[PDB]
Each structure stands twice: as C-alpha cells, then as structure tokens.
Amino acid sequence: GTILIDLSPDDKEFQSVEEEMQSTVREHRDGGHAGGIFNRYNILKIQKVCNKKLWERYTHRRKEVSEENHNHANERMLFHGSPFVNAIIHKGFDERHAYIGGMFGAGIYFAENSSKSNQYVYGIGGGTGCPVHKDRSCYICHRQLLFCRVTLGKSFLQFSMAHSPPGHHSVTGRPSVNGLALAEYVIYRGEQAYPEYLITYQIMRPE
Ligand SMILES: CC(C)c1ccc(-c2cc(=O)c3ccccc3o2)cc1
Numbered sequence: 001g002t003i004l005i006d007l008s009p010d011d012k013e014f015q016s017v018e019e020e021m022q023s024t025v026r027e028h029r030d031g032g033h034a035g036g037i038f039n040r041y042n043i044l045k046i047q048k049v050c051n052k053k054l055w056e057r058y059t060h061r062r063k064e065v066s067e068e069n070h071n072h073a074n075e076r077m078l079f080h081g082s083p084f085v086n087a088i089i090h091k092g093f094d095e096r097h098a099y100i101g102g103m104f105g106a107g108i109y110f111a112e113n114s115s116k117s118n119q120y121v122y123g124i125g126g127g128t129g130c131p132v133h134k135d136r137s138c139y140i141c142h143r144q145l146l147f148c149r150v151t152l153g154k155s156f157l158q159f160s161m162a163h164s165p166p167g168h169h170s171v172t173g174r175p176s177v178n179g180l181a182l183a184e185y186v187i188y189r190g191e192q193a194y195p196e197y198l199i200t201y202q203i204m205r206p207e
Pocket residue numbers: 079080081082083096097098099100109110111116117118120123124184185
C-alpha cells in the first residue's frame with residue numbers, strides 16, 4: 001500500500017525538512033566512529049511516504065493517547081535511522097524495529113539530532129559501515145533516514161518490546177552531560193510513529 005511522492009527542491013515542504021536535517025547535526029562523543037565525520041549532508045532526495053492503512057493506524061493510536069492525556073498527543077517530528085527503513089515504510093514500525101539493548105529498554109528510538117539517527121543507518125554503532133566499502137564514514141554511498149511523526153503522550157523524563165513506564169506513553173532521554181546534545185525518545189508501540197519522510201543523502205567530508 002505504500003507509495004512514495006518525490007518532493008521538488010523548490011517546495012517549501014522539501015526546504016523545511018532539509019533545514020531540520022542540516023540544522024540538527026552535532027558532533028558526537030565517539031569522534032565520528034559510528035556515523036562518520038561530517039558537519040552537514042548532501043541531500044539527494046526527499047520523498048513523502050503515503051500509506052492510508054499505516055496513517056489510520058497512527059491516528060487511531062494518537063487519539064487514544066490524546067484522550068489519556070488531557071487531549072494532548074504531544075506530537076513531535078523526529079529522526080529515525082535504521083537498516084530496516086524499507087520494511088518500515090512498507091509495513092510500519094513494529095517490535096522488530098526496537099532497540100533491544102537501548103538504555104531506556106526495548107523500544108523504538110528517535111532523535112532530535114539527525115546526526116544521532118545517522119549513527120544507526122548501518123546498524124547499532126554503525127555496524128560495519130556501508131555495504132559496499134565497509135566504511136562507517138563513507139562519503140560515497142547513499143544513506144536514508146526517516147523523519148517521523150511521533151506521538152509521545154505523557155513522557156517519562158530520564159536525566160542521563162518492553163512496556164512504557166506505568167502512567168506514561170513514552171520515555172524522554174534528557175542529556176545531562178553533553179550540553180550540545182538534543183533529546184532522544186522511546187516509544188513502545190509501533191502505532192505511535194508514522195514514517196512521514198524518506199530522506200536520501202550522503203554525509204559530506206569537512207573541507
Ligand atoms: C538495528 C536495531 C533494530 C536498531 C537499533 C536502534 C536504532 C536507532 C535509531 C535511531 O534513530 C536512534 C536515535 C537515538 C537513539 C537511538 C537510536 O536507535 C535503529 C535500529
């Protein structure tokens with residue numbers, strides 16, 4: 001049921017998605033080990049992911065969360081990087097996309113920093129890098145991230161598939177050391193995220 005619509009680079013919607021991608025790059029404490037050394041990306045394509053059944057699955061669950069939280073879905077747009085992006089865009093998020101060893105338990109993880117999600121495109125810790133060159137910092141191979149609509153509801157604040165903490169719909173990992181890191185988030189129901197945009201890109205070698 002999924003169809004992909006290409007956005008023109010002249011479209012305001014392409015431009016605002018690119019800006020979120022580029023402006024949320026940061027340096028990582030691994031010095032680029034997992035995701036590569038770069039300060040910006042070359043955006044190659046931005047596609048809208050359209051699937052009626054998966055959308056309705058998302059909005060059904062969003063209403064349930066909203067009704068449990070004074071009519072407030074607490075909806076965000078967040079990045080997700082995964083070796084399973086093709087499964088996700090066709091069949092939705094489910095328990096097979098959960099980070100089983102994540103620091104906030106077995107759930108599906110999302111990031112404000114695009115560069116954090118970039119660290120997972122080739123797997124946990126960057127795996128062995130790109131399939132073709134076995135390079136986690138490959139500047140040639142095309143990568144894909146998802147920019148996702150995510151329902152947080154009442155989020156458990158952690159300063160720093162399972163179930164949400166009792167009385168909560170998600171977990172927030174608040175950075176408590178790296179002053180420049182943005183928040184990361186975990187949901188425990190695949191129906192709480194819709195993979196809105198598929199972004200194809202390369203990391204760029206700093207000059
Ligand atoms: C290969 C397994 C299934 C997997 C594990 C973690 C991720 C993932 C993806 C993210 O975008 C992310 C963002 C912030 C913190 C952790 C994150 O982890 C994706 C797939």
